[PDB]
Design a binder for these strands. Structure first.
Ligand SMILES: [Mg+2]
Ligand SMILES: [Mg+2]
Ligand SMILES: [Mg+2]
Ligand SMILES: [Mg+2]
Ligand SMILES: [Mg+2]
Ligand SMILES: [Mg+2]
Ligand SMILES: [Mg+2]
Ligand SMILES: [Mg+2]
Ligand SMILES: [Mg+2]
Ligand SMILES: [Mg+2]
Ligand SMILES: [Mg+2]
Ligand SMILES: [Mg+2]
Ligand SMILES: [Mg+2]
Ligand SMILES: [Mg+2]
Ligand SMILES: [Mg+2]
Ligand SMILES: [Mg+2]
Ligand SMILES: [Mg+2]
Ligand SMILES: [Mg+2]
Ligand SMILES: [Mg+2]
Ligand SMILES: [Mg+2]
Lengths: 120, 325, 63, 144, 192, 54, 113
RNA sequence: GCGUGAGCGAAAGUUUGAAAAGCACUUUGGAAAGAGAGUGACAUAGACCUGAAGUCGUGACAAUAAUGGAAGUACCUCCAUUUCGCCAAAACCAGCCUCUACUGAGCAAGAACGAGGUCAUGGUUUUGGCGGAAAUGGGGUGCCCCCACCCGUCUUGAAACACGGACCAAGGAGUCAAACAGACGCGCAAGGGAGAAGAUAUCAGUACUUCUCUCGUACUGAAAGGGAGAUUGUGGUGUGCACACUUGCCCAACAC
RNA sequence: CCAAAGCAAGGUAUUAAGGCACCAAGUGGGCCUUCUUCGGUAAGCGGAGCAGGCGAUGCGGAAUGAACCGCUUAGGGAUAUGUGGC
RNA sequence: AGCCCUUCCGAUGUAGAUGUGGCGUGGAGGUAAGGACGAAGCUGAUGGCGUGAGCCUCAGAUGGACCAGCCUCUAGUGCAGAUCU
RNA sequence: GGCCAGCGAUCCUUUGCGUAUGAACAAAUCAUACCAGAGGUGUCAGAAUAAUUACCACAGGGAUAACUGGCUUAUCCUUCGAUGU
């Protein structure tokens, strides 16, 4: 189970980034890069992420139904509480953060269009 | 159960049940304890010469000569004459505790813990989170455990095999290795360790006849089911390696390690250790309805502050009214 | 030299431990023997009636 | 592991736990067991009371193989009998037979409450074992 | 600026975390730490603290000693009361000296392969603390037990042998070395 | 030492008064605080305290 | 607002060029510093611990977090008001061009951009 | 190299550079050398990688027993951060603090009103000042006032007229083995474990196993020797978690 | 036990977490002082009893002082004190 | 760099004991990453962080090619003092 | 036993006492053992021990003399990796 796995990868894993004594996750699927069981979605039976996808917000999801078939264990879906509505569809507790990342993904996307355009 | 993806292509060639070994307990501490001690057996004696630093004639000049009483090399006509000698502190002198050829270089591990460990590190490779956790790029992998068609060992040419690795999606973790290769940091490089590179997928052949094309194909370690090595199953002593089981190597993986309920046919009376927990996710229990039912469901100075005193002594205002006059 | 200084201090650190309670190491043994031997004869009979008593309570409890 | 020695903890604390006074020497008393009858007398007498002296008859050239008489109690004969074979053993019926030399035992001490009969087959027996073993309806048969 | 005399001496030394490296103990402490805090039950508070103990202080119990202590407990139970679960925070070991045992329902960290088979040969369940929590979240008719530790051979060595009251076992590779004439010996008995 | 006046008792109990609670040194602030400490139908007020200690 | 802003220097580092300024606890009965006479240097102790919610916080207000490559920046994407990437000293000026025009696009702070 | 000798016995990295391309030629000098020039990507790479400390020279600068601590301030800051927010001041609320009675004029005596203080107290802003610079912080140097006995050491006692202490760099001291023990971790558990060795597959490793052996499950006696259940089951009793039931059973454990 | 069934024996104020075990170190030159003494002509002397100290501990004070006085000690601020002062 | 918050009590200390997701060193199994757009080393009114051991950054008008992080393993592992060499 | 002081390990010897061992077997002898005394360690919790060194030596000691200051009228406080009578 995940209770056991997390207690295995907790002291070390590819994803733990214990730098300067600070501990952030390199995990693709973590939302706030906080090395926590709530978030370590690579580990969780179910998981949700709200990364950008070329201007578009992307909301990768991982219902457990796929089980252990990594090639297809994760299911993307491109797309502001609506994204949170999708993420809660799989992980209800992740949603409050999944909304707030999903926003900050938007301000980043707006901020960089301002920056990428200003780089001209 | 587990589908057996063909080497030739994406399509599965059929399904096989998980051998009970993958259901076996994952105990990282034993994989670590066994790995730690097991890695010492590869290990090789070093020692200083029996009589280094001590190969001189030396005597202390005694006291009464305005010099420390360390032994001094005698004679004359040389730079080393009168030079201190033998003590660990001196040049050319002896090391503190000279190294011996009879250090305990190697270790005993109980045959059972060595087995508890190979079990736990295979069971740890059945779990994609642990296996991608340790470093492997498993994102293209069709499934974990990745069992694969038996004729994958029929390959002769190396690029027959390279075609196979892309098919099963393993090549992204083999690219992980070819790219991970560089000159070792530190001294180890002038000690025949000049190149370090990351562990990649461990193909596991049914028997010795499979290897040829998969030799040389760098970043692809080969393994034999009939001699699985915990030094390879848990590199670094961390469980979770990526293993490409061959279908033949996989189906006989309970013939080797046995069930929780049935002895190994090769390892004597060995039998998979019973989980300490029948229900290994404690958090699901705590949140269970059977368990939820039983759960248990400004002023400082009180004498001079007016509101504080009126609170401690409700009658105080009825008393202060008495004070007027 | 024989000064007893710092001794009652060093002794009252872990207190003067008070003596064992009378209900503990209450061995007889070196007790005036003839009494001691008759006491065995009674205590052994207490045991046969203690056990005989529990055998009673169970048979009584089959009801 | 050198990492874990308190050698490594007290790097910096000048006397490595041996004390500023009363300095860590060499052999502040003698080598080994020196003064077992002198300045370490209080020590051996407290802890190793029988240590000094002689107690009995000598046995020149002892041969322990002839002396080899390992024992199994009645209470432990289930260790030898197959649990499957031992399943039904009425005293008046057929019994499991248990050679004890095969199993590495020589005498048969008659300890606890045997109750399942067996025909134990052993070199030696206790006064109480052959009695108990019979009263259970089993039988020791002497062998060598 | 405070008398503290006798305060430090009253400080207790207790384990507050397991030294066990075993992951499952930690999922098992994770449970009963929770369950001990979130329930009013004193059973969870015992299973939780014992679970934090040394394997020294978690002594194994004979299945023989469960069958004894259990029937001795259950024999008095009023008819139609099923017997208590026999929880132990330790290993449960088979006993050759008791071939036939009652359909016990033992619950322990670990079972010998012999204990587990005899336990099920009697038809008794051999359940873990996981479903102990799921069947007895509270210690409801559990019968928590401990394995013995006085007969442990380490404690036979406690004290001195040479001291008159004592029957400590002297440390000796050589049994015949410190053997002694009856005359020269410490007095066996001595009143405290 | 001496014989406190009723006023001296008030000031200490109201100003400097601290209950032991779960071994905690707890500043008196509520009569709720006092009735919980003293499970005693007699001792409820901080006025109960000042009468007792006077 | 720090307890102590000064280093706790080793006693008599100033007289002996070889001694590093780095702290060693004084020993020797007669050490003026461990006997803690008032005119002497101080020793470090638990009491100089910094306030614990302002601890590790650089005057920028960020906690520094090491960064080595452009991927690390996303470890700070969602907590960019709490952590500030400090690019490692040994990343190339090459790669730093890439970390920096990307640490700009993401709104993550960098201590040495 | 040393010693009559037996014998003792060093230091030394040619690690310039990719290559010698190892500075031709001009110029001063008797020369060594210097100034140019040249080679090379670099010659503060020049017969030499790096290039520390300490020491010294020099320039500039602050300055006027040592060191040191505390706190400021003066000046400087190739530093940090912040601002285009920083310094202030006032207010409000809270907190906090300070500032009759009896008696025969006195006390052993109680509050009240009123007012003040304060953010190195909490919360409420307001208002101004400053904004290539400002601002806070750090750093440096000096000063001021103040504090301050050289450290290590054995010792009852060290600033000692007690020992060791010129500088710096590199080195330097609880190690390895083994036998016990306790503790802690792990494995299995009335068993545990192998060792030597073998057999195999592929690499002094891993995997595998026979047969044994060994510690243990039984102790005791000098020894011959003998060798432990109770009246389908805790030998009893006392005190004894938990649970059960409104006392039972008691685990362990101690005691008898 | 008694002559005996009765006797004997075993059985139906303030405060404060108590006890027990294991392993192990350092230590085993002490010194001063309080009071009490003993020896010594006397001592900054030898010896003890008691307690407290220094040792191992600063800080504040007695101008100065190992042990006197006050107070004993995390990093700081306000307040108020202690011994001592003005 | 404590899951968060709340309240309470303690804090000296030689010999000594113990703790420490305590510091730091050479090496190893791992992981992750860096480097001729300049590694290590060294220099530093380079600041920053940490009670601290220390780490980090800046700058070299230093260097010239290796190498930090993290978990595990290891040790010939930390020096003002030995009339130390 | 004569109140209370009047006495002593291990090894060994020796004496007694009631079987045991001398291990291929057996008896006798011898020896050993158990067991209980005795022989003694008076340095009395128990090595078996003469001087000398100014020819002397080493490790230390101001734990300890002379000496050197102090105190007192001898102490042993400083100093024995040296304070010139
Ligand atoms: Mg050498
Ligand atoms: Mg040499
Ligand atoms: Mg003495
Ligand atoms: Mg210390
Ligand atoms: Mg020690
Ligand atoms: Mg010394
Ligand atoms: Mg000593
Ligand atoms: Mg001494
Ligand atoms: Mg013998
Ligand atoms: Mg026992
Ligand atoms: Mg050079
Ligand atoms: Mg002295
Ligand atoms: Mg035994
Ligand atoms: Mg003063
Ligand atoms: Mg402390
Ligand atoms: Mg080394
Ligand atoms: Mg400088
Ligand atoms: Mg060393
Ligand atoms: Mg004596
Ligand atoms: Mg003296």
């Amino acid at each position: 189970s995940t209770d056991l796995q997390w207690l295995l990868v907790r002291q070390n894993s590819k994803f733990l980034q214990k730098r300067n004594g600070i501990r952030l996750s390199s995990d693709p699927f973590n939302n706030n890069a906080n090395w926590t069981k709530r978030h370590a979605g690579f580990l969780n039976t179910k998981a949700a992420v709200v990364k950008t996808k070329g201007d578009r917000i992307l909301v990768t999801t991982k219902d457990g139904k796929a089980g252990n078939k990594p090639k297809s264990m994760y299911k993307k879906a491109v797309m502001a509480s609506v994204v949170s509505k999708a993420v809660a569809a799989v992980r209800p507790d992740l949603a409050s953060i999944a909304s707030r990342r999903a926003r900050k993904m938007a301000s980043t996307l707006e901020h960089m269009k301002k920056v990428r355009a200003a780089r001209k | 159960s587990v589908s057996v993806y063909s080497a030739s292509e994406d399509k599965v060639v059929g399904t096989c049940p998980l051998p009970a070994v993958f259901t076996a307990p994952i105990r990282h501490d034993i994989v670590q304890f066994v790995h730690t001690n097991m890695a010492k057996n590869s290990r090789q004696a070093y020692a200083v010469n029996r009589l280094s630093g001590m190969n001189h004639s030396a005597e202390s000049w005694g006291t009464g000569r305005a010099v420390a009483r360390i032994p001094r090399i005698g004679g004359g006509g040389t730079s080393t004459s009168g030079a201190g000698a033998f003590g660990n502190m001196c040049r050319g002198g002896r090391m503190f505790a000279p190294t011996k050829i009879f250090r305990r270089w190697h270790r005993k591990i109980n045959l059972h813990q060595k087995r508890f460990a190979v079990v736990s590190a295979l069971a740890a490779s059945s779990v994609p989170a642990l296996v991608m956790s340790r470093g492997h790029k498993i994102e293209n992998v069709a499934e974990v455990p990745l069992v694969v068609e038996d004729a994958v060992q029929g390959y002769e040419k190396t690029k027959e095999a390279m075609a196979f690795l892309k098919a099963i999606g393993a090549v992204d973790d083999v690219n992980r290795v070819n790219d991970s290769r560089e000159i070792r940091a530190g001294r180890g490089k002038m000690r025949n360790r000049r190149y370090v590179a990351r562990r990649g997928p461990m193909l596991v052949m049914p028997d010795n006849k499979g290897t040829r094309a998969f030799r040389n194909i760098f970043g692809l370690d080969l393994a034999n089911v009939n001699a699985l090595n915990l030094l390879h199953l848990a590199p670094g002593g961390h469980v979770g390696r990526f293993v490409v089981w061959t279908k033949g190597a996989f189906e006989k993986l309970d013939s080797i390690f046995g069930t929780f309920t049935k002895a190994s046919a090769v390892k004597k009376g060995f039998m998979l250790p019973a989980p300490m927990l029948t229900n290994t996710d404690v958090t699901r229990i705590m949140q269970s309805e059977e368990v939820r039912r039983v759960l248990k469901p400004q002023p400082t100075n009180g004498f001079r502050n007016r509101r504080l005193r009126l609170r401690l002594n409700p009658f105080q205002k009825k008393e202060s009214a008495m004070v007027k006059g | 030299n024989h000064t007893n200084h710092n001794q009652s201090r060093k002794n009252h650190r872990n207190g003067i431990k008070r003596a064992l309670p009378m209900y503990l190491h209450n061995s007889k043994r070196g007790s005036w023997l003839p009494a001691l031997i008759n006491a065995r004869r009674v205590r052994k009979n207490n045991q046969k009636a203690a056990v005989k008593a529990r055998r009673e309570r169970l048979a009584a409890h089959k009801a | 592991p050198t990492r874990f020695k308190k050698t490594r903890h007290q790097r910096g604390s000048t006397f490595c736990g041996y004390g500023r006074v009363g300095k860590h020497r060499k052999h502040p008393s003698g080598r080994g067991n020196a003064g077992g009858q002198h300045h370490h007398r209080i020590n051996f007498d407290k802890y190793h009371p029988g240590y000094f002296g002689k107690c009995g008859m000598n046995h020149y050239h002892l041969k322990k193989n002839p002396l080899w008489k390992p024992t199994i109690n009645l209470n432990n004969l289930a260790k030898l009998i197959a649990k499957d074979e031992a399943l039904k053993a009425k005293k008046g019926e057929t019994l499991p037979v248990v050679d004890l030399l095969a199993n590495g035992y020589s005498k048969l001490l008659g300890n606890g409450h045997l109750q399942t009969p067996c025909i134990v087959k052993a070199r030696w027996v206790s006064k109480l074992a052959d009695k108990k073993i019979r009263k259970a309806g089993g039988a020791v048969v002497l062998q060598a | 600026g405070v008398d503290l005399t006798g305060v430090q001496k009253k400080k207790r030394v207790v384990r507050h975390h397991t030294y066990s490296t075993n992951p499952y103990i930690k999922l098992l402490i994770k449970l009963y730490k929770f369950l001990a805090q979130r329930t009013n039950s004193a059973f969870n508070k015992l299973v939780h603290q014992r679970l934090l103990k040394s394997r020294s202080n978690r002594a194994p119990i004979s299945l023989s000693r469960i069958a004894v202590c259990m029937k001795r407990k259950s024999v008095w139970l009023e008819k139609g009361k099923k017997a208590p679960i026999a929880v132990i925070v330790g290993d449960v070991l088979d006993d050759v000296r008791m071939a036939r045992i009652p359909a016990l329902r033992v619950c322990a960290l670990r079972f010998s392969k012999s204990a587990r088979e005899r336990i099920t040969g009697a038809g008794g369940e051999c359940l873990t603390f996981d479903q102990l929590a799921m069947v007895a979240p509270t210690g409801k008719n559990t019968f928590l037990l401990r394995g013995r530790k006085s007969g442990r051979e380490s404690v036979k060595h406690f004290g001195a042998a040479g001291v008159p009251g004592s029957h400590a076992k002297p440390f000796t590779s050589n049994r015949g070395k410190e053997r002694q004439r009856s005359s020269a010996r410490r007095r066996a008995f001595r009143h405290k | 030492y001496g014989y406190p006046s009723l006023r001296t008792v008030r000031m200490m109990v109201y100003k400097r008064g601290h209950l032991k609670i779960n071994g905690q040194r707890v500043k008196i602030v509520n009569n709720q605080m006092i009735e919980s400490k003293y499970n005693n139908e007699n001792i409820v007020c901080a006025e109960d305290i000042v009468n007792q200690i006077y | 607002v720090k307890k102590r802003t000064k280093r706790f220097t080793r006693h008599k580092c100033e007289l002996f060029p070889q001694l590093s300024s780095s702290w060693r606890k004084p020993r020797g009965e007669d050490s003026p510093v461990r006997r803690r006479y008032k005119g002497q240097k101080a020793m470090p102790n638990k009491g100089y611990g910094s306030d614990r919610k302002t601890k590790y916080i650089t005057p920028s207000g960020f906690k520094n977090f090491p960064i080595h490559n452009v991927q690390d920046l996303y470890m700070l994407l969602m907590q960019n008001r709490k952590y500030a990437g400090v690019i490692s000293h040994t990343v190339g000026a090459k790669s730093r061009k890439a970390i920096v025009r990307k640490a700009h696009e993401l709104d993550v702070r960098l201590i040495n951009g």
